Amino acid sequence: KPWWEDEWEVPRETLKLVERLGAGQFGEVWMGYYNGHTKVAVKSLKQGSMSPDAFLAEANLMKQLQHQRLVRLYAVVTQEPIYIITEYMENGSLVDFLKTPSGIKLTINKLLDMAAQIAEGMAFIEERNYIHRDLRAANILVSDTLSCKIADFGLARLIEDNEYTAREGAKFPIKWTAPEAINYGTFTIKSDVWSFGILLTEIVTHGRIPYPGMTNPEVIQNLERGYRMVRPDNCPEELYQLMRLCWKERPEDRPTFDYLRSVLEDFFTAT
Numbered sequence: 001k002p003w004w005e006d007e008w009e010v011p012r013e014t015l016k017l018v019e020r021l022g023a024g025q026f027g028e029v030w031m032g033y034y035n036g037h038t039k040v041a042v043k044s045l046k047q048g049s050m051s052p053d054a055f056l057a058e059a060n061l062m063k064q065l066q067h068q069r070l071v072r073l074y075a076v077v078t079q080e081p082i083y084i085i086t087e088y089m090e091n092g093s094l095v096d097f098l099k100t101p102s103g104i105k106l107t108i109n110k111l112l113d114m115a116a117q118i119a120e121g122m123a124f125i126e127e128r129n130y131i132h133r134d135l136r137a138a139n140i141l142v143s144d145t146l147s148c149k150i151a152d153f154g155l156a157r158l159i160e161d162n163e164y165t166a167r168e169g170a171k172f173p174i175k176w177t178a179p180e181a182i183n184y185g186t187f188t189i190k191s192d193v194w195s196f197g198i199l200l201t202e203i204v205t206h207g208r209i210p211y212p213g214m215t216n217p218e219v220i221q222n223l224e225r226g227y228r229m230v231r232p233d234n235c236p237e238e239l240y241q242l243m244r245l246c247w248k249e250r251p252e253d254r255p256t257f258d259y260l261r262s263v264l265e266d267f268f269t270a271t
């Protein structure tokens with residue numbers, strides 16, 4: 001729909017940007033208010049840093065993917081400077097939150113709860129025929145009630161035919177990305193499943209970098225030998241074995257996110 005018919009379009013005047021949360025090459029992220037009272041996150045595009053079409057493509061995708069477990073699109077301003085306005089998540093990224101004094105005190109029970117919430121979000125994405133491709137604790141946000149939501153849909157894509165193939169030139173974080181995606185650029189929900197396994201290590205280590213003490217070339221070489229990540233300190237063996245399922249060699253052997261959700265809820269209630 002054009003901007004004058006789009007239910008997400010809001011006049012810029014409805015927004016007051018209050019506190020800057022991040023700034024990068026491509027713009028800024030602000031905590032702000034909509035119509036005086038409603039707290040929102042505002043992501044602004046830095047003119048010229050990247051295509052406005054490419055910028056807004058993330059919002060169009062979020063229009064299609066609405067769920068309690070996914071960070072919700074609130075509004076857009078489609079005239080420069082372009083804003084994507086989303087649900088504000090009071091406890092920030094999961095990776096940061098697990099290091100704070102509150103984060104540090106969380107029991108294994110609560111961490112397992114949070115993991116299940118994430119798999120729940122990812123099971124919705126899976127059901128809808130999407131993939132995320134950037135799944136990692138930095139892209140999970142935490143609410144004031146300590147619930148978790150999937151965030152950052154910049155790389156997320158609808159599939160028609162099982163697979164999205166990236167470019168030859170395209171580069172992805174080695175530690176989080178499935179081997180078939182790094183090697184062939186072929187991404188499926190099963191690649192996201194692999195990333196979820198890595199995300200689990202971040203949860204249980206309170207945000208530590210995966211594959212302790214290893215460079216990227218060492219990670220690639222270890223995996224090719226059939227090794228997987230060494231058991232993190234203080235990881236329940238059950239959870240470790242669940243990570244290993246995520247890291248199966250053949251994508252089709254990796255579990256569904258609905259299975260992962262189910263298992264993690266069992267782990268959580270048993271604890």
Ligand SMILES: COc1cc(Nc2nn3c(NCC(C)(C)N)cc(C)nc3c2C(N)=O)cc(OC)c1
Nearest residue numbers: 021022029041043086087088089090091092093141
């Ligand atoms: C300082 O970072 C914080 C960020 C948030 N919330 C948010 N931070 N954040 C982003 N920045 C992530 C950074 C780079 C900051 N790690 C990006 C997007 C698209 N949305 C959000 C929210 C969002 N949707 O709310 C809440 C905090 O409260 C502790 C602290």
